Amino acid sequence: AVAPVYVGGFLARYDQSPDEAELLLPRDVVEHWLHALSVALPLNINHDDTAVVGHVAAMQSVRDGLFCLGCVTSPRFLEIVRRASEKSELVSRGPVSPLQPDKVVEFLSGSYAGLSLSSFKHVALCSVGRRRGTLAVYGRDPEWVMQRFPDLTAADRDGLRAQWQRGDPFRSDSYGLLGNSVDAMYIRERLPKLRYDKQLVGVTERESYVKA
Amino acid sequence: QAVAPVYVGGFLARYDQSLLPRDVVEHWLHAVALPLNINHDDTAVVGHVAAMQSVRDGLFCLGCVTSPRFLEIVRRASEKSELVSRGPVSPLQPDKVVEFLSGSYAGLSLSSTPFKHVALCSVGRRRGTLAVYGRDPEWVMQRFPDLTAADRDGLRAQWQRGDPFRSDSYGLLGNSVDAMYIRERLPKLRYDKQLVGVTERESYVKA
């Protein structure tokens, strides 16, 4: 529905050892980045600057990584998704048992299962993220989405919660989303990577609309 | 440009793939035309099958995507694709529409008067069902080593001798996401390519 959709997830996962054994981004290197939110960080589709769907409501550098909570607010984008979801068999199959069907959230969960902070500038919703653990979790309530991630601390969530609170931007079209999906269809290890990110961030231990 | 018809040919069934029997397809057919649609959606007819020839290895088909509306949607979608922008293999000329069609509807699917239509899908359920697109019928037919000169004259005799697409981009978009979650999609398509020897040819196939 044109009620907004929230999306949360890790943009980057932090190296936990004292010697870079994992080759992940150091927490203080990324925190320098953060330190370096007054200007709105746009949320776009697959890095396309004409395809702004909403914005990042909060970014919190936590123990395991840099978590992000964005808001998909664009009526046009949500309408396109509403229209495409009505023609998807995957969506008609429905979520996992206890969850209430939600065609848009479910369409988004399958189409843009990844998050990507990169060429801050913007956060991109894409079919998969390159960095480890960048799975995108959508839901209607921001509280439910943060609760999908076991890594998050009561304090971490309060850290985010404080930020998110204290003319349609989408200038693209369905064709742009159509072209993206075909490219996505040829990304080779997409599902595997998704499944790996899900486990890593622990959404496998929670009920969600994640299609992977 | 794009709104020039695109031909599509491939096997709808392979008689060696472990059910369409050699004997039956041969007599209703081998011894007015089925519409060609997108993923079995009857409101998504993009053209029609022009010829079907029962041959040594399977049931070969040749269809033509004619809908100016469908082709228009595809041309506009094709320029927003990074895969299409990467172009085909060297000698071949960039054909954004043909390449887009190759990417998204890499498979053919015969629905089974004994069949309702032939469907262009992300992958067909029957193996060996790769969809080979191209601007010239002779060129696509020639993509398949299996086909004999005799078979070709057989198919050829079948062509020589209102916009039906009532769907839209939004529909194609719903389709693409379903395709994204079909698990061994690429593997199946790669197997399909080897099976019909399309690997032994240059083509717009993206798998």
Side-chain angles (χ1 to χ4, degrees):
Chain A
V2 70
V5 178
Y6 292 80
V7 60
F10 283 95
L11 290 173
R13 282 317 220 79
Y14 293 152
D15 214 299
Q16 310 284 103
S17 47
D19 64 326
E20 315 181 336
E22 308 150 14
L23 262 25
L24 284 165
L25 278 286
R27 171 172 177 152
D28 294 85
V29 149
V30 174
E31 286 180 358
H32 153 57
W33 285 355
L34 293 198
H35 168 65
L37 184 143
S38 308
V39 310
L41 200 59
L43 245 190
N44 66 39
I45 301 298
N46 304 94
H47 299 286
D48 188 341
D49 39 335
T50 197
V52 174
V53 305
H55 70 282
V56 186
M59 284 200 296
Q60 191 76 11
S61 181
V62 300
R63 198 104 301 149
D64 304 303
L66 175 62
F67 191 88
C68 177
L69 204 289
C71 196
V72 180
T73 55
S74 170
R76 263 191 304 264
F77 177 72
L78 289 170
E79 170 66 5
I80 298 172
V81 167
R82 202 273 297 156
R83 290 189 192 213
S85 68
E86 79 117 328
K87 300 300 187 193
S88 169
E89 308 303 321
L90 179 60
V91 171
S92 56
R93 267 178 291 234
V96 289
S97 191
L99 294 189
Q100 73 189 358
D102 188 341
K103 298 190 165 193
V104 166
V105 171
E106 285 181 71
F107 182 85
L108 290 168
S109 298
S111 266
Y112 309 105
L115 238 46
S116 187
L117 174 78
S118 59
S119 336
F120 303 92
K121 205 187 304 84
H122 69 253
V123 161
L125 298 178
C126 38
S127 54
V128 222
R130 277 191 84 244
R131 294 186 176 290
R132 276 166 296 166
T134 48
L135 181 88
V137 167
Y138 300 91
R140 299 296 183 160
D141 197 279
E143 286 297 320
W144 183 79
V145 334
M146 285 182 304
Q147 283 289 347
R148 254 62 252 131
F149 307 84
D151 289 309
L152 296 191
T153 270
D156 292 341
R157 300 189 235 99
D158 196 49
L160 294 152
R161 195 186 295 124
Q163 311 178 44
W164 124 63
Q165 58 203 256
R166 261 53 93 53
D168 197 314
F170 189 76
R171 302 150 187 113
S172 201
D173 53 18
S174 62
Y175 296 132
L177 304 176
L178 229 197
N180 289 10
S181 67
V182 184
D183 299 324
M185 293 171 241
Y186 287 79
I187 297 189
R188 300 292 216 77
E189 297 152 325
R190 180 179 173 270
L191 252 36
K193 171 65 162 61
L194 252 13
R195 289 185 228 119
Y196 162 81
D197 295 340
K198 207 182 171 187
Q199 272 135 245
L200 187 56
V201 171
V203 165
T204 43
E205 291 300 292
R206 293 297 186 253
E207 34 157 41
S208 74
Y209 287 106
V210 175
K211 294 303 180 178
Chain B
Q1 173 85 358
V3 209
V6 174
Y7 297 82
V8 56
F11 283 86
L12 288 177
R14 268 266 166 151
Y15 308 122
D16 36 294
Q17 224 58 340
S18 29
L19 291 202
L20 276 50
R22 176 83 129 290
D23 164 45
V24 304
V25 275
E26 248 164 82
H27 221 91
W28 109 267
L29 176 72
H30 205 32
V32 55
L34 300 172
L36 184 51
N37 65 42
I38 302 303
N39 260 113
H40 305 279
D41 190 340
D42 42 288
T43 62
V45 41
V46 306
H48 73 286
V49 183
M52 269 164 115
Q53 165 86 22
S54 190
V55 302
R56 176 193 180 99
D57 302 85
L59 180 51
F60 193 88
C61 144
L62 207 311
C64 195
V65 188
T66 60
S67 164
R69 179 163 190 239
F70 174 64
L71 267 7
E72 171 61 355
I73 290 164
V74 169
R75 191 208 102 239
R76 291 178 57 37
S78 71
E79 39 223 45
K80 297 314 303 298
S81 178
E82 241 234 71
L83 180 73
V84 175
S85 292
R86 281 188 267 275
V89 283
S90 187
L92 289 165
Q93 218 210 349
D95 192 335
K96 293 189 169 300
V97 166
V98 162
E99 293 173 66
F100 187 77
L101 289 167
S102 298
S104 326
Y105 312 99
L108 267 359
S109 181
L110 190 58
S111 61
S112 179
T113 183
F115 305 120
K116 327 178 197 161
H117 55 249
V118 169
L120 301 186
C121 6
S122 53
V123 234
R125 234 166 301 167
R126 272 173 183 299
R127 298 278 56 76
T129 190
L130 187 74
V132 168
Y133 299 89
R135 296 297 181 166
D136 179 30
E138 302 299 310
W139 186 77
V140 348
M141 206 153 69
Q142 200 84 292
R143 259 55 241 148
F144 301 91
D146 36 82
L147 290 178
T148 75
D151 297 336
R152 296 196 245 90
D153 271 71
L155 286 154
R156 186 178 302 109
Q158 300 173 55
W159 341 311
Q160 300 289 45
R161 167 160 72 173
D163 217 311
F165 191 75
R166 303 184 194 159
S167 190
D168 58 25
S169 209
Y170 298 107
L172 303 185
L173 198 39
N175 252 322
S176 53
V177 73
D178 290 352
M180 287 175 248
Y181 290 72
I182 295 179
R183 189 55 197 130
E184 299 291 39
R185 208 183 86 249
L186 295 171
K188 285 161 182 168
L189 258 358
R190 289 193 208 99
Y191 169 87
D192 290 357
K193 296 193 53 173
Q194 302 179 55
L195 202 79
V196 303
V198 173
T199 42
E200 305 184 309
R201 287 302 185 299
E202 276 202 303
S203 65
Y204 288 108
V205 179
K206 301 296 189 166

